[PDB]
Design a protein around this ligand. Structure first.
Ligand SMILES: CC[C@H]1OC(=O)[C@H](C)[C@@H](O[C@H]2C[C@@](C)(OC)[C@@H](O)[C@H](C)O2)[C@H](C)[C@@H](O[C@@H]2O[C@H](C)C[C@H](N(C)C)[C@H]2O)[C@](C)(O)C[C@@H](C)C(=O)[C@H](C)[C@@H](O)[C@]1(C)O
Ligand SMILES: Nc1nc2c(ncn2[C@@H]2O[C@H](COP(=O)(O)OP(=O)(O)O)[C@@H](O)[C@H]2O)c(=O)[nH]1
Ligand SMILES: [Mg+2]
Length: 299
């Protein structure tokens, strides 16, 4: 670790970031980069990304564009701001608060910061406000966005195509497939509006204060303009129908896009969860996700 800590210090120093050596901690990271936490000489907490792959700029372009949008328009939540952004180092000040929960991959569930048997209503109220603000950001006003952008019709067709791709790469259980198709063909259930979404909203990416207000969102790699419903799935899976309704309520009442079958639609999107597991398996290539997909897909 001494080896790595000296390199971190050297790399940071090279970008005029001066760290307290004894605060440097390494996260268990993936195949794109190594996340490092450290405090600087001014007393400010930082998050560093040490790149593990080539072509950092092309691979981060979309995420940076999303961050640029959110930092430009949003006030109800913090998002990362890459003050240092090079092929050798990406660094940003740590957002306030702590993750609402962190995934333990052994048990296949969260280690919660909040009381899962008594979820504070402020979590839903604040996340509702946050998502409402995010999803109303006028991404159309940008001159050269490289984000995926769907009209409502395109969002529906995207799911249709993604599902076919999964029926054909993994094969899909008959019963599961037919529920999906019934969903796709229900014109009235589908949203008639899209917006800029985070795309990976879950407890590990929602920073909360001591009162469980969502004060920030991290990890914007999945940002795009599409069905807003993806940002509600976490609430349903973690908190059940009550948590989903609570989020929809707050969102609707502060001006978020709402339609009569929104809840039903999100529940159907949840039933399509296997599509995402299958895709991450295909992409990452990891057996657990493979089998997880295989089970989820009911093959
Ligand atoms: C409730 C408790 C469960 O959590 C959820 O269901 C939340 C709500 C999922 O998000 C939901 C909701 C949504 C929108 O993601 C936030 C959706 O995309 C995924 C498929 O399911 C999470 C986070 C998924 O992660 C995401 O998987 C994607 C394939 C890639 C994505 N990311 C790296 C790019 C990643 O974060 C995924 C697969 O469940 C993580 C693996 C480890 C699990 O199977 C773990 C054990 C979960 O079952 C869980 C903790 O028990
Ligand atoms: N508390 C806190 N943790 C962070 C912050 N930024 C990153 N992290 C942690 O570092 C981990 C990796 O960051 P992330 O951008 O999600 O990397 P990725 O999961 O590989 O895409 C996250 O799961 C967080 O636990 C932050 O601003 N505050
Ligand atoms: Mg992450």
């Amino acid at each position: 670790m001494s080896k790595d800590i000296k390199q971190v210090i050297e790399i940071a120093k090279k970008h005029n970031l001066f760290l307290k050596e004894e605060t440097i901690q390494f996260n268990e990271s993936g195949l794109d980069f190594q996340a490092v936490f450290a405090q600087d000489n001014n007393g400010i907490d930082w998050v560093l990304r040490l790149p593990r792959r080539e072509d950092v700029m092309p691979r981060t372009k979309v995420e940076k564009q999303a961050l640029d949008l959110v930092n430009k328009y949003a006030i109800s939540f913090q998002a990362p701001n890459w003050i240092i952004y090079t092929e050798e180092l990406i660094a940003m000040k740590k957002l306030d608060g702590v993750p609402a929960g962190t995934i333990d991959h052994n048990i296949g569930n969260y280690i919660w910061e909040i009381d899962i048997n008594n979820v504070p209503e402020l979590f839903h109220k604040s996340l509702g406000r946050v998502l409402a603000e995010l999803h109303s950001i006028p991404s159309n006003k940008a001159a050269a966005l490289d984000l995926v952008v769907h009209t409502p019709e395109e969002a529906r067709m995207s799911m249709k195509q993604r599902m076919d791709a999964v029926r054909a790469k993994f094969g899909v259980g008959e019963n599961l497939w037919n529920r999906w198709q019934a969903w796709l063909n229900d014109d009235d259930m589908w949203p008639k509006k899209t917006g800029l979404i985070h795309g990976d909203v879950h407890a590990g990416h929602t920073m909360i204060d001591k009162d469980a207000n969502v004060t920030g969102l991290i990890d914007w790699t999945e940002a795009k303009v599409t069905d807003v419903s993806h940002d509600f799935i976490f609430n349903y899976r973690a908190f059940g129908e009550e948590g989903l309704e609570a989020l929809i309520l707050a969102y609707k009442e502060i001006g978020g896009y709402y339609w009569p079958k929104m809840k039903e639609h999100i529940i159907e999107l949840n039933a399509a969860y296997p599509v995402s597991i299958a895709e991450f398996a295909l992409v990452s290539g990891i057996e657990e996700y493979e089998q997880m997909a295989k089970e989820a897909l009911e093959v």
